[PDB]
Structures are given as structure tokens and as C-alpha cells.
Design a protein around this ligand. Structure first.
Ligand SMILES: Cc1ccc2c(c1)C(=O)[C@]1(O[C@@H](c3ccc(Cl)c(Cl)c3)[C@@H](C(=O)Nc3ccc(-c4csnn4)cc3)[C@H]1C(=O)O)C2=O
Ligand SMILES: Cc1ccc2c(c1)C(=O)[C@]1(O[C@@H](c3ccc(Cl)c(Cl)c3)[C@@H](C(=O)Nc3ccc(-c4csnn4)cc3)[C@H]1C(=O)O)C2=O
Length: 196
């Protein structure tokens, strides 16, 4: 290896290009994740050849490149799976398909159209937490996908699949962390509901 650096700068230049694109095409995002794998494959290689730097850039530990390459594969795979469905032609932003969002509740589900939910604990203006409720959640099933919606009640934020209600934000747990009483007020939209 020798052109490793010339190849890495071309990859990172490409990543910057993909970022700037600000595309809504799920397929560009899949290609973006493939390039993240390429970058980490090259940085991982560079660390093995003993290199410490590549044009001002610091070569990361093998464990870091291994971790990014792994996350990139997971993202790429789930996106391609979702891409084989009626949902894949919908608009998908770079943010909607990030690992960051993937790990945001509900974890390991895709989601879109987030809205704000405020919870005031005890009834003290300075005790207000903000949460997100997603209008569209895509749940995985083997290799098929299901589109569901969210709702809010005195107990928390949840999505409905059939007769099952799954909460991705528990208002009682939140209380034990930012409140002292088991009394709280919830506000989303023009709607308000208080804990009993
Ligand atoms: C301009 C610009 C400005 C800010 C950022 C970037 C670019 C990025 O690419 C960054 O996004 C992250 C990331 C980018 C891509 C992916 Cl896949 C992920 Cl998970 C995060 C991160 C990153 O690499 N996070 C990370 C932290 C710890 C580990 C690790 C593994 S084992 N021990 N530590 C690995 C990655 C970081 C980055 O690559 O520098 C980030 O914060
Ligand atoms: C398809 C595609 C392909 C590769 C990547 C993405 C998307 C990303 O979003 C990633 O960009 C990172 C980043 C990390 C920091 C910087 Cl500054 C830059 Cl440019 C890139 C990082 C990251 O932190 N992104 C991120 C996305 C959304 C939010 C957000 C905004 S409002 N709610 N959530 C925050 C972070 C990471 C990731 O988590 O996926 C990335 O490497």
C-alpha cells in the first residue's frame, strides 16, 4: 500500500460531497454509509501499516475504525431492507437515516416528523422537560416493515401496533429523575393532560 492517502482523501472528499448534497433519496444515503465503511477500512489499514497521521489527520485506534465500520454495515443493511418496500420511495433525509437517530427512542426503528412534548413536573415552571413524539415510525419484521403512529397520554409517549401500545418514553421514570412528586402536566399541540 502507498496510495492509501491519495485514496483516503478522495473518500473523505466524497463524504463531504454526500453531506453537502442534502438529498432526500434513500439510495444516496445507502451509498453514503458504504463510503463510511470505505473510510474506516482505509483508516483501519493505515493503523496496521503503523502510520500515525495522514496529512494533519490523526489515524484512529483499530477498535474505533472497527466500530464505525460495524455501525455503517448495520445502517446500510437496514436501509437497503427498507428500500425494498413501498416506504423506500418516501423522502428520507440524511438525518432520518443517521446512526444518531437510529439509537434515539424508539431505538432501532426508523422515524420521521417529530413533534415536541413538554412535561412540567410538580407544577414548577423551571421543571420542564422536552420530548419527541414521532408521527411516523417504521418497525422491522424479519425483512418486512410496518408503518405505525404515536400518541400521548398521562403515562407517556407510545406507538400502536395492532392492540399493543409500546411506550418509548415513560413519564413515571422521568419523574423519579427530575421531580419529587408523582404529579405532572403534559403538553403537546393544544392538548394538556395531567397525571392522576
Ligand atoms: C465535521 C464533523 C464534525 C463532527 C463529527 C464528525 C464530522 C463525525 O464524523 C463524527 O460523527 C461520529 C460518528 C460517525 C459515524 C459513525 Cl458510524 C458513528 Cl457511530 C459516529 C463521530 C465518531 O467517529 N464517533 C465515534 C466515537 C467513538 C468510537 C469508538 C468506537 S470503540 N471506541 N470508541 C467510534 C466513533 C465523529 C467522527 O468521526 O469524528 C462527529 O462527531
Ligand atoms: C446517511 C448518513 C451517512 C453517514 C452519516 C450520517 C448519515 C450521519 O448523520 C453521521 O454524521 C455524523 C456527524 C456528526 C456531527 C457533525 Cl457536525 C456532522 Cl457534519 C456529521 C453523525 C451524527 O452525529 N449525525 C447526526 C445526525 C442527526 C442529528 C440530529 C439533528 S436534530 N436531531 N438529531 C445529529 C447528528 C453520523 C450519524 O449518527 O449517522 C454519519 O457519519
Amino acid at each position: 500500500h502507498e496510495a492509501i492517502a491519495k485514496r483516503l482523501d478522495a473518500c473523505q472528499d466524497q463524504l463531504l460531497e454526500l453531506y453537502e448534497e442534502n438529498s432526500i433519496d434513500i439510495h444516496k444515503h445507502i451509498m453514503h454509509w458504504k463510503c463510511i465503511r470505505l473510510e474506516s477500512v482505509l483508516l483501519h489499514k493505515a493503523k496496521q501499516m503503523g502510520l500515525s497521521h495522514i496529512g494533519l489527520q490523526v489515524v484512529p485506534p483499530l477498535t474505533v475504525s472497527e466500530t464505525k465500520g460495524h455501525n455503517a454495515i448495520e445502517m446500510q443493511m437496514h436501509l437497503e431492507s427498507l428500500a425494498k418496500t413501498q416506504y423506500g420511495v418516501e423522502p428520507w433525509t440524511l438525518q432520518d437515516t443517521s446512526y444518531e437517530m437510529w439509537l434515539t427512542p424508539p431505538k432501532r426503528c426508523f422515524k420521521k416528523q417529530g413533534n415536541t412534548v413538554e412535561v412540567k413536573f410538580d407544577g414548577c415552571e423551571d421543571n420542564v422537560m422536552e420530548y419527541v413524539v414521532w408521527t411516523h415510525i417504521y418497525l422491522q419484521d424479519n425483512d418486512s416493515w410496518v408503518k405505525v403512529t404515536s400518541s400521548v397520554d398521562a403515562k407517556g409517549i407510545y406507538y400502536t401496533c395492532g392492540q399493543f401500545k409500546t411506550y418509548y418514553v415513560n413519564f413515571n421514570k422521568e419523574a423519579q429523575k427530575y421531580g419529587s412528586t408523582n404529579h405532572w402536566e403534559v403538553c403537546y399541540g393544544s392538548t394538556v393532560i395531567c397525571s392522576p
